[PDB]
């Protein structure tokens, strides 16, 4: 594998071998086998950051990049003159991005660190797709634009829409085509608590609060809409957000 060398763990969960010391140039070796492919490379860092290359059976190019802190890692095929990318995979902190292009269409799936997943399909150049987001018990649906993803719950006359932003900001809106005005919903969003309050009828209904852990809960208003009552409850089902919406 690498005489004289040493093993380093990187993001993924994947390993690079290193030289224990240094060539007449200064730069040291650097060996990885990806998904049974052999990478070779020299860097002039001695902690396992660099890059490595290796060329597939069918001729296409491999390339990883390990950054000069370890964070990161960066897993590029190309076709075989080197000049197209066929993917990149991009895995730092538990968390992966991997993105895939062909025909004018692009994919991409986000793999986050808690297991839940964000993945775009069918994405075209002018930066719409389609969206799915993968969450502990439930799936949400919806689209990509240029400027946000919108993924939309429906219940009778209403829609909820969780909005993310290209930073990964979330907000959230509510429309209602409720022609009765004394049940119509309408809700307000607060950025700085992550929470949808719904009204009803001139009184506060419920609080939605969208968490750091790509969870919903949903807490309770008094009879006057006044005061928040219980506690919290997180919701585990697709269902539990159509019943917060009726």
Same mark, same amino acid.
């Given at each position: ?82 000049? @197209? =990318? #066929?993917? +990149?995979?991009? *895995?730092?902190?538990? %968390?992966?991005?991997?993105? $895939? /292009?062909?025909?004018? &269409?692009? !994919? ?41 993803? @919108? =993924? #939309?719950? +429906?219940?009778? *006359?209403?829609?909820? %829409?969780?909005?993310?932003? $290209? /930073?990964?900001?979330? &907000?959230? !809106? ?43 809960? #949903? ?7 006044? %005061? ?19």
């Amino acid at each position: 594998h690498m005489k004289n060398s040493v093993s380093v763990d990187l993001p993924g969960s994947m390993k690079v071998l290193v030289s224990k010391s240094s060539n007449a140039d200064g730069k040291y070796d650097l060996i990885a086998t990806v998904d049974a492919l052999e990478l070779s490379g020299t860097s002039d860092k001695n902690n396992g950051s660099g890059v490595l290359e290796g060329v597939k059976a069918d001729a296409s190019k491999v390339k990883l990049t390990i950054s000069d802190d370890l964070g990161q890692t960066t897993l590029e095929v190309f076709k075989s003159d080197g000049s @197209t =990318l #066929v993917s +990149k995979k991009v *895995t730092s902190n538990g %968390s992966s991005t991997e993105e $895939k /292009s062909s025909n004018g &269409s692009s !994919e991409k799936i986000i793999t986050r660190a808690d297991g839940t997943r964000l993945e775009y399909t069918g994405i075209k150049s002018d930066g719409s797709g389609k969206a799915k987001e993968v969450l502990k018990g439930y799936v949400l649906e919806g689209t990509l634009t240029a400027e946000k993803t @919108t =993924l #939309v719950v +429906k219940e009778g *006359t209403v829609t909820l %829409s969780k909005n993310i932003s $290209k /930073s990964g900001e979330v &907000s959230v !809106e509510l429309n209602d085509t409720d022609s009765s005005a004394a049940t119509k919903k309408t809700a307000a969003w607060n950025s700085g608590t992550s929470t949808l309050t719904i009204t009803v009828n001139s009184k506060k209904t419920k609080d939605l609060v969208f968490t750091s852990s790509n969870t919903i809960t #949903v807490q309770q208003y008094d009879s006057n809409g006044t %005061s928040l009552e219980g506690s919290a409850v997180e919701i585990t089902k697709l269902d539990e957000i159509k019943n917060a919406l009726k």
